[PDB]
């Protein structure tokens, strides 16, 4: 699961996305987070939708 | 591979994406085309990047 070697803020980058309204069907979200990192500011821009 | 029972235009829906410059790194494009269907017009609207 989540070991003490994992940064509590690093894992929170995933939960933050879910609360933002970001969901995955095939699991492309977790894949995107591995290619474009957990950078919310970058991922949000990837789909243009930043406000509505 | 590609059985003769498959529509030659249906398989081109994926090729068309490549011709548009659409390519995935984490392999999410080949996934999106399954869940959201091979609806090119719909996929382009998913990220709003349909103009430029």
UniProtKB/Swiss-Prot annotation, chains A, B:
Cite the UBA domain residue spans from the record: 5-50
What is the recorded phenotype of mutating residue 19 to A?
A: Abolished phosphorylation by CK2, leading to decreased affinity for ubiquitinated proteins. Abolished ability to promote relocalization of 'Lys-63'-linked ubiquitinated STING1 to autophagosomes
Question: Where on this protein does the Glycyl lysine isopeptide (Lys-Gly) (interchain with G-Cter in ubiquitin) crosslink form?
Answer: 36
Inducers of expression: By proteasomal inhibitor PSI and prostaglandin J2 (PGJ2) (at protein level). By phorbol 12-myristate 13-acetate (PMA). Expression is directly activated by NFE2L2/NRF2; creating a positive feedback loop.
Q: In what tissue types does this protein appear?
A: Ubiquitously expressed.
Describe the effect of residue 41 to R: In PDB3 and FTDALS3; loss of polyubiquitin-binding and increased activation of NF-kappa-B
- In which compartments does the protein localize? Cytoplasmic vesicle, Autophagosome; Preautophagosomal structure; Cytoplasm, Cytosol; Nucleus, PML body
Site of the Glycyl lysine isopeptide (Lys-Gly) (interchain with G-Cter in SUMO2) crosslink? 51
Q: Which chain regions cross the lipid bilayer?
A: none
Question: What result follows from mutating residue 51 to Q?
Answer: Mimics acetylation; leading to increased ability to bind ubiquitinated proteins
**Post-translational modification as stated in the protein's UniProt record:** Phosphorylation at Ser-23 by ULK1 destabilizes the UBA dimer interface and increases binding affinity to ubiquitinated proteins. Phosphorylation at Ser-23 also primes for subsequent phosphorylation at Ser-19. Phosphorylation at Ser-19 by CK2 or ULK1 promotes binding to ubiquitinated proteins by increasing the affinity between the UBA domain and polyubiquitin chains. Phosphorylation at Ser-19 by ULK1 is stimulated by SESN2. Phosphorylated at Ser-19 by TBK1, leading to promote relocalization of 'Lys-63'-linked ubiquitinated STING1 to autophagosomes. Ubiquitinated by UBE2J1 and RNF26 at Lys-51: ubiquitinated SQSTM1 attracts specific vesicle-associated adapters, forming a molecular bridge that restrains cognate vesicles in the perinuclear region and organizes the endosomal pathway for efficient cargo transport. Ubiquitination by UBE2D2 and UBE2D3 increases its ability to bind polyubiquitin chains by destabilizing the UBA dimer interface. Deubiquitination by USP15 releases target vesicles for fast transport into the cell periphery.
Impact when changing residue 47 to V: Partial loss of polyubiquitin-binding. Loss of localization to cytoplasmic inclusion bodies
> What's the effect of swapping residue 36 to Q?
Mimics acetylation; leading to increased ability to bind ubiquitinated proteins
- Residue numbers of N6-acetyllysine PTMs: 36, 51
Q: Which domain of life is it from?
A: Eukaryota
Q: Which residues are annotated with the PTM Phosphoserine? A: 19, 23
Biological role stated in the UniProt entry? Molecular adapter required for selective macroautophagy (aggrephagy) by acting as a bridge between polyubiquitinated proteins and autophagosomes. Promotes the recruitment of ubiquitinated cargo proteins to autophagosomes via multiple domains that bridge proteins and organelles in different steps. SQSTM1 first mediates the assembly and removal of ubiquitinated proteins by undergoing liquid-liquid phase separation upon binding to ubiquitinated proteins via its UBA domain, leading to the formation of insoluble cytoplasmic inclusions, known as p62 bodies.
UniProt note: domains: The UBA domain binds specifically 'Lys-63'-linked polyubiquitin chains of polyubiquitinated substrates. Mediates the interaction with TRIM55. Both the UBA and PB1 domains are necessary and sufficient for the localization into the ubiquitin-containing inclusion bodies.
Which disease is given in the protein's UniProt record? Answer: Paget disease of bone 3: A disorder of bone remodeling characterized by increased bone turnover affecting one or more sites throughout the skeleton, primarily the axial skeleton. Osteoclastic overactivity followed by compensatory osteoblastic activity leads to a structurally disorganized mosaic of bone (woven bone), which is mechanically weaker, larger, less compact, more vascular, and more susceptible to fracture than normal adult lamellar bone. In a cell model for Huntington disease (HD), appears to form a shell surrounding aggregates of mutant HTT that may protect cells from apoptosis, possibly by recruiting autophagosomal components to the polyubiquitinated protein aggregates.
Its recorded name reads Sequestosome-1
Stretch of the intact protein here: 387 to 436 of 440
């Amino acid at each position: 699961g989540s070991p003490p070697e994992a940064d509590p803020r690093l894992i929170e980058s995933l939960s933050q996305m879910l609360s933002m309204g970001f969901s995955d069907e095939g699991g492309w979200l977790t894949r995107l987070l591995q290619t474009k990192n957990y950078d919310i500011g970058a991922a949000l821009d990837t789909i243009q939708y930043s406000k509505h």
